[PDB]
Amino acid sequence: PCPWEWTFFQGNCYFMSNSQRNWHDSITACKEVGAQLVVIKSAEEQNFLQLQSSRSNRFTWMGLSDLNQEGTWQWVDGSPLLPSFKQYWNRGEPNNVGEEDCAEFSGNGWNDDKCNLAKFWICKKSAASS
């Protein structure tokens, strides 16, 4: 079972925060609970997490950025953003407006936004590690 206040899906536990943090502080918060700011590995996990964020009406960080090389999106575990996953950007994203280097769930897909903006966040860790 997942810890109190967490969400189970496909053998992992997810913490949907109830406070807001900028993207770096969200990474730290997840590391504090032995988790990671969420790295999506499958289409079904994307569809699941996207829906949680859309129906909660909450702009939410995930563990994805182009801070290192503009236009090259990397997950916080080092894995590249696969071209097929680029289907999950909202229409007209990522658009880098005013420089935007971190990815959030926004509505029915992903947006790039300012990494120093405070948003809700989602951490992920194995249920077996919980």
Ligand X SMILES: COC(=O)[C@H]1C[C@H](OC[C@H]2O[C@H](OCCN=[N+]=[N-])[C@@H](O)[C@@H](O)[C@@H]2O)[C@@H](O[C@H]2O[C@H](CO)[C@@H](O)[C@H](O)[C@@H]2O)C[C@@H]1C(=O)OC
Instruction: Using CB under 5 A, list all residues that contact Cl ion.
Output: 1-2, 8, 36, 76, 101, 114-115
Mapped onto helix, strand or coil, the DSSP state of residue 30 is: helix
Dist CA 62 CA 49 (whole Å): 10
Q: Which segments of the chain does DSSP mark as H helices, in order?
A: 23-32, 43-55
Q: Is residue 82 a contact residue for ligand X (CB under 6 A)? A: no
Q: 70 contacts which partner out of Cl ion, Ca ion, ligand X, none, CB within 5 to 8 A by kind?
A: Ca ion
Interstrand relation of 120-126 and 60-69 (parallel, antiparallel or unpaired): parallel
Q: Choose the one of ligand X, Cl ion, Ca ion, none that binds residue 104, judging by a C-beta under 5 to 8 angstroms depending on kind.
A: none
Cα separation, 107 vs 111, whole angstroms:
9
Nearer to Ca ion, 35 or 102 (CB): 102
* Footprint of ligand X on 13-42 (CB under 6 A): none
Per CB under 6 A, residues contacting ligand X are 93, 95, 97-98, 100, 111-113
